[PDB]
Design a protein around this ligand. Structure first.
Ligand SMILES: O=C(NCc1cc(F)cc(Cl)c1)[C@@]1(O)CCN(c2ccccc2)C1=O
Ligand SMILES: [Mn+2]
Ligand SMILES: [Mn+2]
Length: 365
């Protein structure tokens, strides 16, 4: 059984190696009204589903580690803690439960703990003295993986009840996106449905009223093996592309709500980086740059990483080698994404499997 604090790897809690399924859903009906129930008992669909059983099982193991980590985080995350303390305590638990083992199992991307106007991609670098405040709105977004089968799942933390309606708006919008998702569903329809739900909410924060706006330049996305953003985008506003979701794809369904402009821009010091998946082999002679690329290739491959993780591996004086990798287009920087100063942003996110037989919200217990 799991300890308190959690320290037993998920693999040791399920001795037979069969990990728990997430929530299973029938796909939404078509506009004409034809149900998709036929998938659950179809001979061809069960065969295609069974063929990918090892892949779904890997996602389920990573999802169980993610659920146990986030229940642990909710039990202790409190104002007054530094953002570094929060990230290191969360990551220490995640490394243990996922039974971190090089590229076979581990952390899929850095722990995002973006605050207030910053909506995403913020994790502290060394020396960051930022402390979580009682009035902050903190987005905890972290990932686990087994064999590069990634769980991307996020939630918002608050201490002041004044943001409760903002959180409910975004949670309802994300649950709408999850409900609307399915094989052959136009991605633009998912976005329109999400916006319609999110914008039906009005919030009052310190005597100022706001209509909740989805962050138009943030979105959900397809997930590939060791590829957090596989190429398809799930909009959270109307006006997107009518491109459809397909059988066997994995999506992160996420929404962001804001009291600001509903648009993010790169801001602050960069902490997140990730190798460009489309860049092949590049011989490097420059020694510090060569060394850092070897470190990245061995420890992260195409998964996102952060500067704190390079520090933890014992690397130092690597910032110019890292900028060289960015300038060569081998690595890409992912700086914090912020709405206007004084604005509040919230996020909820789950990972879904578009299985031939059903839609499984694998990160939801
Ligand atoms: O977990 C997440 N990010 C991790 C990540 C770290 C990294 F370094 C590189 C990548 Cl691509 C992803 C998010 O859910 C939060 C924001 N976000 C997103 C950003 C822009 C457009 C659409 C979505 C995601 O996917
Ligand atoms: Mn995420
Ligand atoms: Mn995501």
């Amino acid at each position: 059984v799991q300890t308190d604090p959690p320290s037993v790897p998920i693999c040791d809690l399920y001795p037979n190696g069969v990990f728990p399924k997430g929530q299973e859903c029938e796909y939404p009906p078509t506009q004409d009204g034809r149900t998709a129930a036929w998938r659950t008992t179809s001979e061809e669909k069960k065969a295609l589903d069974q063929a990918s059983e090892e892949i779904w099982n890997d996602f389920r193991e990573a999802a169980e580690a993610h659920r146990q980590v986030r229940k642990y985080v909710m039990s202790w995350i409190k104002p007054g803690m530094t953002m570094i303390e929060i990230c290191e305590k969360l990551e220490d638990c995640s490394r243990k439960l996922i039974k971190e083992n090089g590229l076979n199992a581990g952390l899929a991307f850095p722990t995002g703990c973006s605050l207030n106007n910053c909506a995403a991609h913020y994790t502290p670098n060394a020396g960051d003295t930022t402390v979580l405040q009682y009035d902050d709105i903190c987005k905890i977004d972290f990932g686990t993986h087994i064999s590069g089968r990634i769980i991307d799942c996020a939630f918002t933390v608050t201490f002041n009840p004044k943001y409760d309606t903002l959180l409910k708006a975004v949670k309802d919008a994300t649950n709408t996106g999850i409900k609307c998702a399915g094989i052959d569903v136009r991605l633009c329809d998912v976005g329109e449905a999400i916006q319609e739900v999110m914008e039906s909410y009005e919030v009052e924060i310190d005597g100022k009223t706001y209509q909740v706006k989805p962050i138009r330049n943030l979105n959900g996305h397809s997930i590939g093996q060791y590829r957090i953003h596989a190429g398809k985008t799930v909009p959270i506003v109307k006006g997107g592309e009518a491109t459809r979701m397909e059988e066997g794809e994995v999506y992160a369904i996420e929404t962001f709500g804001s009291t600001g402009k509903g648009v993010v821009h790169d801001d602050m010091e960069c902490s997140h980086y990730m190798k460009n998946f489309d860049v092949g082999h590049v011989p490097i002679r420059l020694p510090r740059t060569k060394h850092l690329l070897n470190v990245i290739n061995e420890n992260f491959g195409t998964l996102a990483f952060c500067r704190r993780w390079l520090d933890r591996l014992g690397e130092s004086k690597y910032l110019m080698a890292l900028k060289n990798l960015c300038d060569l287009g081998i690595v890409d920087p992912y700086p914090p994404l912020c709405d206007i100063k004084g604005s509040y942003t919230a996020q909820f996110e789950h990972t879904i499997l578009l299985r031939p037989t059903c839609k499984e919200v694998v990160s939801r217990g």
